[PDB]
RNA sequence: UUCAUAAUAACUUUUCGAAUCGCAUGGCCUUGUGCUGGCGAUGGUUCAUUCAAAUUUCUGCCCUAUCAACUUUCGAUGGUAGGAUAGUGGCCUACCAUGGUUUCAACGGGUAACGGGGAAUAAGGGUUCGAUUCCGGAGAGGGAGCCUGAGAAACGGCUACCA
RNA sequence: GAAACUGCGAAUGGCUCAUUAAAUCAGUUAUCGUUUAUUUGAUAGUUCCUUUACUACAUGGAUAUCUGUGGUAAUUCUAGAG
């Protein structure tokens, strides 16, 4: 089934389709938050290791963390919980949700890749996706720079330049606090 | 869901009032606190108009006051010995208002010792002159000395742990104690 | 109703706003403020209807927003502000000043009143209490809480707020033989002198009032507002001074004072 | 009035006591980013006031006795203490007392009954109507349960059963 | 100036008369028996705790929006990553 792999440090991710019945066999009976070695999931996944963080059932129902069940269940979700977003304040809703134990009923497995392996993936182990915007708060910018705080963090704010086609103009965030 | 409205009650005459205006939210009643002893665990409940209320189940220590010389001290509640409403709470050690409890009684003891120093149960010149000016007025009655020798004070709680969250009360003293000890001797 | 009510249908509006029963389904509900909505007067009613300076709601909104209205020395940019009895409405444009006093028919009449006296306001004392840390304070009918009042100022009394600093300037003590105004019931707008104040142990004080024309009536003490000493009112009384001429006398006034 | 308020002793899984925005950015010279400094906007504890909300006293309701006794073990009337309540209150619990209404019609039954301001009718007295332009109450298919808030037992908010 | 977070209203208004015969309601009282966003008027030095060593010229981390990967036949369904 579909596997959504995401490498955080490179900030990259990809989707992988697997049809073999035995590569996914190790994913069976493994709950969210566990670690599975990449040797048993693919001969091109040597050295890799996979944290399992969420997924989607064949019916589209995602799996909630901490359900410890290989089946679906109807739960009364509210604000703070995942698998649900409230429209009105305090709007509890009873919705179906897949359990946290991975079984054959899953359709997508969301997988963090934790340890860099031997054979590099195409654009995940190799490429890096830049962060779309930097820090905004003054001390946050200082920490991101290691700026020896009494150093006039005013100027060191990042500045993104965009060209309208005729005029090149700068846009930089306003510093809070 | 526990209502406290008067509609469900029969009329003064005795007629069975027909159902009308399904019960509201400004008529609600919540579960009893039925507090216990030990491992302080107070749960806030958001009541009408904010005004955080505090359920005080499992409460072990609280403030207690002495009326004669009028001094208050934090001290431990050690079990309940009598309840004027239901002895079932006494057997279950459920602590509500007006219940009668026992007190570790030490803080009162060395407060007395540093205040009068009469050595119950059996220095700087300023303190000596204070004691001399006192001139042994601490002629506090005999039964309180009796349970001071015993070590556990007899107190009646006055705060409402169900609402306030505190565990405050006052020691039995004077004819108060008298009355209740008779009742206790009735239990004995 | 579950909660507060925020709509005032036109027929349910007080008959002293005396709007047109047609040309509208609703009426301006006064927002919360210094006066009871049954007793108060919204600014939109005072401008659109009483003064006709505006024409409709948008015009009143534009008038209030640009800070030309000043209620008791403050701007009050909200459309339905409850400008109540004895409040002062200042318009720097046309440099005009109004004080809301009932005309004897019992209505919030347009009273054009001078700038010099417009600096201050009068108020009835509704409570005298002791707030925290032992500070005495006085609550007037506007809801103004004046701190540190004169020690012998009592309830039902009257006082003269300077309306600039908002402190105590002078006061008049409630007692017999004193010029007085009426602020409710059948005797709206009437002005007289207190002849007697029967105590009525247990509640609802009553006072007897005799006006200049030597007519006599009786009114509840909650309904009473001392306004000064006989012959020397502390404010500028409206035209007619609230004598309550009889309907036949009003007809005779129409017949006599008549020129076309 | 045990009221307002003040005071002492203590208590708190210690609430609040501005790390928030706009405009104008003046004055002092300690001539520096230095010292101060106006008009507002949002907040914020408490006490008032207002919009209110809950209860609450007296009196007033259509037909019917082919409805004369009704209510209490399961609260019926009262007492006390506690719990809950925002708060009084059998509102609920524990233990007691055996009480409360009734021929001045209680209780039960019926209402093709929402109550009222009012409408028709008109010598005077009245008879009938009032679902609906205003004020109240209740309801969102019938039932129960609840989060959020100051305010809902909300339903153009949710939970469950029944249809 | 979209979007989203925040704040506020969504409990007003509108409709219907099904239930309800001391029930609602009307007139008249009471709250010294209580909650009250808002509006309006006032309202606080002590947050130090042994003060002879602290950020007050400003303390911390998430988090939506967004960038990208999906799932379901579909619903104001949203899980993973930055
Ligand atoms: Mg309505
Ligand atoms: Mg007091
Ligand atoms: Mg009681
Ligand atoms: Mg009917
Ligand atoms: Mg009707
Ligand atoms: Mg009718
Ligand atoms: Mg009908
Ligand atoms: Mg209506
Ligand atoms: Mg409803
Ligand atoms: Mg229908
Ligand atoms: Mg709100
Ligand atoms: Mg409902
Ligand atoms: Mg609808
Ligand atoms: Mg609705
Ligand atoms: Mg909803
Ligand atoms: Mg009946």
Coordinates of N, CA, C and O (backbone and C1' of nucleotides) in Angstrom, one line a residue, chain D residues 1 16-19 33-35 44-62 86-88 110-111 113-116 131-132 136-140 149-152, chain E residues 7-47 55-59 76:
Chain D
rU1 P -30.7 46.6 63.4 O5' -29.7 45.3 63.2 C5' -30.0 44.1 63.9 C4' -29.9 42.9 63.1 C3' -28.5 42.6 62.6 O3' -27.8 41.8 63.6 C1' -29.9 42.5 60.7
rC16 P -4.2 35.7 37.9 O5' -4.5 37.2 38.3 C5' -5.6 37.9 37.7 C4' -5.9 39.2 38.4 C3' -4.7 40.2 38.4 O3' -4.6 40.9 37.1 C1' -5.6 40.1 40.5
rG17 P -3.2 41.3 36.5 O5' -2.7 42.5 37.5 C5' -3.4 43.7 37.7 C4' -2.9 44.5 38.9 C3' -1.4 44.8 38.9 O3' -1.1 46.0 38.2 C1' -2.1 43.8 41.0
rA18 P 0.1 46.0 37.1 O5' -0.6 45.9 35.7 C5' -0.9 44.6 35.2 C4' -0.5 44.5 33.7 C3' 0.9 45.1 33.4 O3' 1.6 44.3 32.4 C1' -0.7 46.2 32.1
rA19 P 2.4 43.0 32.9 O5' 3.6 42.9 31.8 C5' 4.4 44.1 31.5 C4' 5.1 44.0 30.3 C3' 4.3 43.5 29.1 O3' 4.8 44.1 27.9 C1' 6.0 41.9 29.5
rU33 P 23.9 57.9 22.5 O5' 23.2 56.8 23.4 C5' 22.1 56.0 23.0 C4' 20.8 56.5 23.7 C3' 19.6 55.6 23.4 O3' 18.8 55.3 24.7 C1' 19.1 57.8 22.7
rG34 P 18.1 56.5 25.5 O5' 19.2 57.5 26.0 C5' 20.1 57.2 27.1 C4' 20.0 58.3 28.1 C3' 18.6 58.5 28.7 O3' 18.3 57.6 29.8 C1' 19.6 60.6 28.2
rC35 P 16.8 57.2 30.1 O5' 16.2 58.5 30.9 C5' 16.8 58.9 32.1 C4' 16.3 60.3 32.5 C3' 14.7 60.4 32.5 O3' 14.2 59.8 33.7 C1' 15.7 62.3 31.5
rG44 P -10.2 41.2 30.8 O5' -9.6 41.7 32.2 C5' -8.3 41.4 32.6 C4' -8.0 42.1 33.9 C3' -9.1 42.3 34.9 O3' -9.4 41.2 35.7 C1' -7.9 44.3 34.6
rU45 P -10.9 40.9 36.2 O5' -10.8 41.2 37.7 C5' -9.9 40.4 38.6 C4' -9.8 41.0 39.9 C3' -11.1 41.5 40.6 O3' -11.8 40.4 41.1 C1' -9.5 43.2 40.8
rU46 P -13.4 40.4 41.1 O5' -13.9 41.5 42.2 C5' -13.4 41.4 43.5 C4' -13.6 42.8 44.2 C3' -14.9 43.4 44.2 O3' -15.8 42.8 45.1 C1' -13.3 45.0 43.6
rC47 P -17.4 42.7 44.8 O5' -18.0 44.1 45.1 C5' -17.7 44.8 46.3 C4' -18.1 46.3 46.2 C3' -19.4 46.6 45.5 O3' -20.5 46.4 46.4 C1' -17.7 48.0 44.7
rA48 P -22.0 46.2 45.9 O5' -22.5 47.7 45.7 C5' -23.4 48.0 44.6 C4' -23.1 49.4 44.1 C3' -23.9 49.9 42.9 O3' -25.2 50.4 43.4 C1' -21.7 50.4 42.5
rU49 P -26.6 49.7 42.8 O5' -26.8 50.4 41.4 C5' -26.9 51.8 41.2 C4' -26.7 52.2 39.8 C3' -27.5 51.3 38.8 O3' -28.9 51.8 38.7 C1' -25.3 51.5 38.0
rU50 P -30.0 50.7 38.4 O5' -29.8 50.4 36.8 C5' -29.9 51.4 35.8 C4' -29.5 50.9 34.5 C3' -30.1 49.6 34.1 O3' -31.4 49.8 33.5 C1' -27.8 49.6 33.7
rC51 P -32.5 48.7 33.6 O5' -32.2 47.7 32.4 C5' -32.0 48.1 31.1 C4' -31.4 47.1 30.2 C3' -31.9 45.7 30.3 O3' -33.1 45.5 29.6 C1' -29.5 45.7 30.4
rA52 P -34.5 45.2 30.3 O5' -34.0 44.8 31.8 C5' -34.4 43.5 32.2 C4' -33.3 42.5 31.9 C3' -33.5 41.1 32.4 O3' -34.3 40.3 31.6 C1' -31.3 41.7 33.0
rA53 P -35.5 39.4 32.1 O5' -34.7 38.2 32.8 C5' -33.8 37.4 32.1 C4' -33.1 36.4 33.0 C3' -33.9 35.7 34.0 O3' -34.6 34.6 33.4 C1' -32.0 36.5 35.0
rA54 P -35.7 33.8 34.2 O5' -34.9 32.7 35.0 C5' -35.5 31.9 36.0 C4' -34.7 31.8 37.3 C3' -35.4 31.8 38.6 O3' -35.9 30.5 38.9 C1' -33.7 33.4 38.7
rU55 P -37.3 29.9 38.4 O5' -38.0 29.4 39.7 C5' -38.7 30.3 40.5 C4' -37.9 30.7 41.7 C3' -38.7 31.3 42.9 O3' -39.3 30.2 43.7 C1' -36.9 32.7 42.4
rU56 P -40.9 30.1 43.8 O5' -41.2 31.5 44.6 C5' -40.6 31.8 45.8 C4' -41.0 33.1 46.4 C3' -42.5 33.5 46.2 O3' -43.3 32.8 47.2 C1' -41.2 35.3 45.6
rU57 P -44.9 32.7 46.9 O5' -45.5 33.9 47.8 C5' -45.1 34.2 49.1 C4' -45.7 35.4 49.6 C3' -47.2 35.6 49.3 O3' -48.0 34.8 50.2 C1' -46.0 37.6 48.9
rC58 P -49.4 34.2 49.6 O5' -50.4 35.4 49.4 C5' -50.8 36.1 50.6 C4' -51.8 37.2 50.1 C3' -52.9 36.7 49.2 O3' -54.0 36.1 49.9 C1' -51.9 38.7 48.3
rU59 P -54.9 35.0 49.2 O5' -55.6 35.7 48.0 C5' -56.6 36.6 48.2 C4' -57.1 37.3 46.9 C3' -57.4 36.4 45.8 O3' -58.7 35.8 45.9 C1' -56.0 38.2 45.0
rG60 P -58.9 34.3 45.2 O5' -59.2 34.7 43.6 C5' -60.2 35.6 43.3 C4' -59.9 36.2 41.9 C3' -59.9 35.2 40.8 O3' -61.2 34.8 40.3 C1' -58.0 36.6 40.5
rC61 P -61.9 33.5 40.9 O5' -62.3 32.7 39.6 C5' -61.5 31.6 39.1 C4' -61.0 31.9 37.7 C3' -61.4 31.0 36.6 O3' -62.7 31.3 36.1 C1' -59.0 31.3 36.5
rC62 P -63.9 30.4 36.4 O5' -64.3 29.6 35.1 C5' -64.5 30.4 33.9 C4' -64.8 29.4 32.7 C3' -65.6 28.2 33.1 O3' -67.0 28.4 33.2 C1' -63.7 27.6 31.7
rA86 P -24.2 27.2 41.3 O5' -23.5 28.0 42.6 C5' -22.8 29.1 42.4 C4' -23.5 30.3 43.0 C3' -24.5 30.0 44.0 O3' -23.9 29.9 45.3 C1' -25.4 31.5 42.4
rG87 P -24.3 28.8 46.4 O5' -25.6 29.4 47.1 C5' -25.5 30.7 47.7 C4' -26.8 31.4 47.8 C3' -28.0 30.5 48.2 O3' -28.0 30.2 49.6 C1' -28.7 31.8 46.4
rU88 P -28.5 28.8 50.2 O5' -30.0 29.2 50.6 C5' -30.3 30.3 51.4 C4' -31.8 30.6 51.6 C3' -32.6 29.3 51.8 O3' -32.6 28.9 53.1 C1' -33.6 30.7 50.2
rG110 P -59.1 13.4 30.9 O5' -60.1 14.4 30.3 C5' -61.3 14.0 29.6 C4' -62.2 15.1 29.2 C3' -61.6 16.3 28.4 O3' -61.4 16.0 27.1 C1' -62.9 17.2 30.2
rU111 P -60.1 16.5 26.3 O5' -60.4 18.1 26.2 C5' -61.5 18.6 25.5 C4' -61.6 20.1 25.7 C3' -60.3 20.9 25.4 O3' -60.1 21.2 24.0 C1' -61.2 21.6 27.5
rA113 P -61.5 24.7 22.6 O5' -60.0 25.1 22.7 C5' -59.3 24.6 23.9 C4' -58.7 25.7 24.7 C3' -57.2 25.9 24.6 O3' -56.7 26.5 23.4 C1' -57.8 26.0 26.8
rC114 P -55.5 26.0 22.6 O5' -54.2 26.7 23.3 C5' -54.3 28.0 23.7 C4' -53.7 28.2 25.1 C3' -53.9 29.5 25.8 O3' -55.2 29.5 26.4 C1' -51.6 29.0 25.9
rG115 P -55.9 30.9 26.7 O5' -55.0 31.6 27.8 C5' -55.2 31.3 29.2 C4' -54.6 32.4 30.0 C3' -55.0 33.8 29.7 O3' -56.2 34.2 30.2 C1' -52.6 33.7 29.9
rG116 P -57.2 35.2 29.4 O5' -56.4 36.6 29.5 C5' -56.2 37.2 30.7 C4' -55.1 38.3 30.6 C3' -55.5 39.5 29.7 O3' -56.4 40.4 30.3 C1' -53.3 38.8 29.3
rA131 P -56.0 32.6 21.8 O5' -55.6 31.5 20.7 C5' -54.6 30.6 20.9 C4' -53.7 30.4 19.7 C3' -53.1 31.7 19.2 O3' -51.9 32.1 19.8 C1' -54.2 30.6 17.4
rU132 P -51.5 33.6 20.1 O5' -51.6 34.3 18.6 C5' -50.6 34.1 17.7 C4' -50.7 35.0 16.5 C3' -50.7 36.5 16.9 O3' -49.5 37.1 17.1 C1' -52.4 36.0 15.3
rG136 P -41.6 41.3 27.6 O5' -41.9 40.2 28.7 C5' -42.4 38.9 28.3 C4' -43.2 38.2 29.3 C3' -43.1 36.7 29.3 O3' -42.0 36.3 30.1 C1' -45.4 37.3 29.2
rG137 P -40.9 35.2 29.5 O5' -41.7 33.8 29.5 C5' -42.3 33.4 30.7 C4' -43.1 32.2 30.5 C3' -42.5 31.1 29.6 O3' -41.6 30.2 30.3 C1' -44.8 31.5 29.0
rA138 P -40.3 29.7 29.5 O5' -40.9 28.4 28.7 C5' -41.7 27.4 29.3 C4' -42.4 26.6 28.3 C3' -41.6 26.1 27.1 O3' -40.9 24.9 27.5 C1' -43.6 27.1 26.3
rG139 P -39.5 24.5 26.8 O5' -39.8 24.1 25.3 C5' -40.7 23.0 25.1 C4' -40.9 22.8 23.6 C3' -39.7 23.0 22.7 O3' -38.9 21.8 22.6 C1' -41.5 24.3 21.9
rA140 P -37.4 21.9 22.2 O5' -37.4 21.7 20.6 C5' -38.1 20.6 20.0 C4' -38.6 21.0 18.7 C3' -37.5 20.9 17.6 O3' -38.2 20.5 16.3 C1' -38.3 23.1 17.7
rG149 P -15.9 28.8 28.7 O5' -17.0 29.9 28.6 C5' -17.0 30.8 27.6 C4' -18.2 31.7 27.7 C3' -18.5 32.3 29.1 O3' -17.7 33.4 29.4 C1' -20.5 31.4 28.2
rA150 P -17.5 33.9 30.9 O5' -19.0 34.2 31.4 C5' -19.4 34.2 32.8 C4' -20.8 34.7 33.0 C3' -21.9 33.8 32.4 O3' -22.3 32.8 33.2 C1' -22.2 36.1 31.8
rG151 P -22.9 31.4 32.6 O5' -24.2 31.8 32.0 C5' -25.3 32.2 32.7 C4' -26.4 32.9 31.9 C3' -27.0 32.0 30.8 O3' -28.0 31.2 31.2 C1' -26.3 34.1 29.9
rA152 P -27.9 29.6 31.2 O5' -29.0 29.2 30.2 C5' -29.1 29.7 28.9 C4' -29.9 28.7 27.9 C3' -30.1 27.3 28.5 O3' -31.3 26.8 28.0 C1' -28.8 27.3 26.5
Chain E
rG7 P -10.0 34.0 22.1 O5' -10.7 35.4 22.0 C5' -10.3 36.5 22.7 C4' -11.1 37.8 22.3 C3' -12.6 37.6 22.3 O3' -13.2 37.8 23.6 C1' -11.9 38.7 20.3
rC8 P -14.4 36.9 24.0 O5' -15.6 37.5 23.2 C5' -16.0 38.9 23.5 C4' -17.0 39.4 22.4 C3' -18.3 38.5 22.2 O3' -19.3 38.8 23.2 C1' -17.3 39.1 20.1
rG9 P -20.3 37.6 23.6 O5' -21.3 37.6 22.4 C5' -22.2 38.7 22.2 C4' -22.9 38.5 20.8 C3' -23.7 37.3 20.6 O3' -25.0 37.4 21.1 C1' -22.3 37.6 18.8
rA10 P -25.8 36.1 21.8 O5' -25.8 35.1 20.6 C5' -26.7 35.2 19.5 C4' -26.3 34.4 18.3 C3' -26.6 32.9 18.2 O3' -27.9 32.7 17.9 C1' -24.4 33.3 17.4
rA11 P -28.7 31.4 18.6 O5' -28.7 31.8 20.1 C5' -29.3 33.0 20.6 C4' -30.1 32.8 21.9 C3' -30.3 34.1 22.7 O3' -31.5 34.0 23.4 C1' -29.1 32.4 23.9
rU12 P -32.9 34.4 22.7 O5' -32.5 35.8 22.0 C5' -32.4 37.0 22.7 C4' -32.2 38.2 21.9 C3' -33.3 38.5 20.9 O3' -34.4 39.1 21.4 C1' -31.2 38.6 19.8
rG13 P -35.9 38.6 21.1 O5' -36.0 38.7 19.5 C5' -36.0 40.0 18.8 C4' -35.7 39.8 17.4 C3' -36.8 39.1 16.5 O3' -37.9 39.9 16.2 C1' -34.6 38.3 16.0
rG14 P -39.4 39.4 16.4 O5' -39.5 38.3 15.3 C5' -39.4 38.6 13.9 C4' -39.5 37.3 13.1 C3' -40.6 36.3 13.4 O3' -41.8 36.7 12.8 C1' -38.6 35.2 13.3
rC15 P -43.2 36.4 13.5 O5' -43.4 34.9 13.3 C5' -43.4 34.2 12.1 C4' -43.4 32.7 12.2 C3' -44.5 32.1 13.1 O3' -45.7 32.0 12.3 C1' -42.4 31.2 13.7
rU16 P -47.1 32.2 13.1 O5' -47.4 30.8 13.9 C5' -47.4 29.6 13.2 C4' -47.3 28.4 14.2 C3' -48.3 28.5 15.3 O3' -49.6 27.9 14.9 C1' -46.2 28.0 16.2
rC17 P -50.9 28.4 15.6 O5' -50.9 27.8 17.1 C5' -50.9 26.3 17.2 C4' -50.6 25.9 18.6 C3' -51.8 26.2 19.6 O3' -51.9 25.2 20.5 C1' -49.8 27.3 20.3
rA18 P -52.7 23.8 20.1 O5' -51.5 22.9 19.7 C5' -51.7 21.5 19.5 C4' -50.7 20.6 20.2 C3' -50.7 20.7 21.7 O3' -51.7 19.8 22.2 C1' -48.5 21.0 21.0
rU19 P -52.5 20.2 23.6 O5' -51.5 20.0 24.7 C5' -50.8 18.8 24.9 C4' -49.7 18.8 25.9 C3' -50.0 19.4 27.3 O3' -50.6 18.4 28.1 C1' -48.0 20.4 26.4
rU20 P -51.9 18.8 28.9 O5' -51.5 20.0 29.9 C5' -50.5 19.8 30.8 C4' -50.1 21.1 31.5 C3' -51.2 21.9 32.2 O3' -51.5 21.4 33.5 C1' -49.9 23.3 30.8
rA21 P -53.0 20.9 33.8 O5' -53.8 22.3 34.0 C5' -53.2 23.4 34.7 C4' -54.2 24.2 35.5 C3' -55.1 23.4 36.4 O3' -55.3 24.3 37.6 C1' -56.4 24.7 34.9
rA22 P -55.1 23.7 39.1 O5' -53.6 24.2 39.4 C5' -53.3 24.7 40.8 C4' -52.5 25.9 40.8 C3' -51.9 26.3 42.1 O3' -50.6 26.9 42.0 C1' -53.2 28.1 41.2
rA23 P -49.4 25.9 41.9 O5' -49.2 25.6 40.3 C5' -49.2 26.7 39.4 C4' -48.8 26.2 38.0 C3' -48.5 27.2 37.0 O3' -47.2 27.7 37.1 C1' -50.0 25.7 36.0
rU24 P -46.9 29.3 37.4 O5' -47.0 30.0 36.0 C5' -46.2 29.5 34.9 C4' -46.7 30.0 33.6 C3' -47.0 31.4 33.4 O3' -45.8 32.1 33.0 C1' -48.9 30.3 32.7
rC25 P -45.5 33.6 33.6 O5' -46.8 34.4 33.3 C5' -47.1 34.8 31.9 C4' -48.5 35.4 31.8 C3' -48.7 36.6 32.7 O3' -48.3 37.8 32.0 C1' -50.5 35.1 33.1
rA26 P -47.7 39.0 32.8 O5' -49.0 39.8 33.4 C5' -50.0 40.2 32.5 C4' -51.2 40.8 33.2 C3' -50.8 41.6 34.4 O3' -50.4 43.0 34.1 C1' -52.5 40.1 35.1
rG27 P -49.1 43.7 34.7 O5' -49.7 44.4 36.0 C5' -50.9 45.2 35.9 C4' -51.7 45.3 37.2 C3' -50.9 45.6 38.4 O3' -50.5 46.9 38.6 C1' -52.3 43.7 38.8
rU28 P -49.1 47.4 39.0 O5' -49.0 46.9 40.5 C5' -49.9 47.4 41.5 C4' -49.8 46.6 42.8 C3' -48.4 46.5 43.4 O3' -48.1 47.7 44.1 C1' -49.4 44.4 43.4
rU29 P -46.6 48.1 44.3 O5' -46.1 47.2 45.6 C5' -44.9 46.5 45.6 C4' -44.9 45.4 46.6 C3' -43.5 44.9 47.1 O3' -42.9 45.7 48.0 C1' -44.9 43.1 46.5
rA30 P -41.4 46.2 47.9 O5' -40.6 44.9 48.3 C5' -40.9 44.2 49.5 C4' -40.2 42.9 49.6 C3' -38.8 42.8 49.1 O3' -37.9 43.2 50.2 C1' -40.0 41.0 48.2
rU31 P -36.5 44.0 49.8 O5' -35.5 42.9 49.4 C5' -35.4 41.7 50.2 C4' -34.6 40.7 49.4 C3' -33.3 41.1 48.7 O3' -32.2 41.2 49.6 C1' -34.5 39.6 47.4
rC32 P -30.9 42.1 49.3 O5' -30.0 41.9 50.5 C5' -30.3 42.4 51.8 C4' -30.5 41.4 52.9 C3' -32.0 40.8 52.9 O3' -31.9 39.4 53.4 C1' -31.6 42.0 54.9
rG33 P -33.2 38.5 53.2 O5' -32.6 37.3 52.3 C5' -31.5 36.5 52.7 C4' -31.0 35.6 51.6 C3' -30.4 36.4 50.4 O3' -29.3 35.6 49.8 C1' -32.3 35.0 49.7
rU34 P -27.9 36.2 49.9 O5' -27.1 35.4 48.8 C5' -26.6 36.0 47.6 C4' -27.0 35.3 46.4 C3' -26.5 35.8 45.1 O3' -25.2 35.3 44.8 C1' -28.8 35.4 44.9
rU35 P -24.1 36.4 44.4 O5' -23.9 36.2 42.8 C5' -23.4 35.0 42.3 C4' -23.8 34.9 40.8 C3' -23.4 36.0 39.9 O3' -22.1 35.9 39.4 C1' -25.7 35.4 39.6
rU36 P -21.2 37.3 39.2 O5' -22.0 38.0 38.0 C5' -22.1 37.5 36.7 C4' -23.1 38.2 35.9 C3' -22.9 39.7 35.6 O3' -21.9 39.9 34.5 C1' -25.1 39.4 36.2
rA37 P -20.9 41.1 34.6 O5' -20.1 41.1 33.2 C5' -19.2 40.0 32.9 C4' -19.0 39.8 31.4 C3' -18.9 41.1 30.7 O3' -17.6 41.6 30.7 C1' -20.5 39.7 29.6
rU38 C1' -21.5 44.3 28.3 C3' -19.7 45.7 28.1 C4' -19.2 44.3 28.0 O3' -19.0 46.7 27.3 C5' -18.0 44.0 28.7 O5' -18.2 44.0 30.1 P -17.3 43.1 31.1
rU39 P -18.1 47.8 28.0 O5' -18.8 49.2 27.4 C5' -20.1 49.1 26.7 C4' -21.1 50.0 27.3 C3' -20.5 51.1 28.3 O3' -19.9 52.2 27.6 C1' -22.5 50.1 29.1
rU40 P -18.6 52.9 28.3 O5' -19.3 53.7 29.5 C5' -20.2 54.7 29.4 C4' -20.8 55.1 30.7 C3' -19.8 55.4 31.8 O3' -19.2 56.7 31.7 C1' -21.5 54.0 32.7
rG41 P -17.8 57.0 32.3 O5' -17.9 56.9 33.9 C5' -18.7 57.9 34.5 C4' -18.6 57.7 36.0 C3' -17.2 57.5 36.5 O3' -16.5 58.8 36.7 C1' -18.7 56.0 37.6
rA42 P -14.9 58.7 36.9 O5' -14.8 58.5 38.5 C5' -13.6 57.9 39.0 C4' -14.0 57.1 40.2 C3' -12.9 56.2 40.8 O3' -12.0 56.9 41.6 C1' -15.0 55.0 40.7
rU43 P -10.4 56.7 41.4 O5' -10.2 55.2 42.0 C5' -10.6 54.9 43.3 C4' -10.8 53.4 43.4 C3' -9.5 52.5 43.2 O3' -8.7 52.6 44.4 C1' -11.3 51.5 42.1
rA44 P -7.2 53.2 44.3 O5' -6.2 51.9 44.4 C5' -6.3 51.1 45.6 C4' -5.2 50.0 45.6 C3' -3.8 50.5 45.2 O3' -2.8 49.8 45.9 C1' -4.6 48.8 43.7
rG45 P -1.7 50.6 46.7 O5' -0.3 49.8 46.4 C5' -0.2 49.2 45.1 C4' 1.2 49.5 44.5 C3' 2.4 49.0 45.2 O3' 3.4 48.7 44.2 C1' 2.5 51.3 45.2
rU46 P 3.8 47.2 43.9 O5' 4.1 46.6 45.3 C5' 5.2 47.0 46.1 C4' 5.3 46.2 47.4 C3' 4.8 44.8 47.3 O3' 5.6 43.8 48.0 C1' 3.7 45.9 49.0
rU47 P 6.1 42.5 47.3 O5' 5.0 42.3 46.1 C5' 4.1 41.2 46.3 C4' 4.3 40.1 45.2 C3' 5.8 40.1 44.7 O3' 6.2 38.7 44.5 C1' 4.3 40.5 42.9
rU55 P 18.4 36.9 35.6 O5' 17.9 38.2 34.7 C5' 18.7 38.7 33.7 C4' 18.0 39.8 32.9 C3' 17.1 40.7 33.7 O3' 17.8 41.7 34.4 C1' 15.9 39.9 31.8
rA56 P 17.0 42.9 35.2 O5' 16.6 44.0 34.1 C5' 15.8 45.1 34.4 C4' 14.9 45.4 33.3 C3' 13.8 46.5 33.6 O3' 13.4 47.2 32.5 C1' 12.8 44.4 33.0
rC57 P 14.3 48.5 32.1 O5' 14.7 48.2 30.6 C5' 13.9 47.5 29.7 C4' 14.5 47.2 28.4 C3' 15.9 46.5 28.4 O3' 16.0 45.7 27.3 C1' 16.1 48.6 27.4
rA58 P 16.1 44.1 27.5 O5' 14.6 43.7 28.0 C5' 14.3 42.5 28.6 C4' 13.0 41.9 28.2 C3' 12.8 41.6 26.7 O3' 12.0 40.4 26.6 C1' 11.2 43.2 27.3
rU59 P 12.7 39.0 26.5 O5' 12.8 38.5 28.0 C5' 13.8 37.6 28.5 C4' 13.2 36.3 28.9 C3' 12.7 35.4 27.7 O3' 13.7 34.7 27.1 C1' 11.1 35.5 29.5
rU76 P -20.9 19.2 2.8 O5' -19.8 20.3 3.4 C5' -19.4 20.2 4.8 C4' -18.1 20.8 5.1 C3' -17.4 20.3 6.3 O3' -16.0 20.3 6.1 C1' -17.8 22.6 6.5

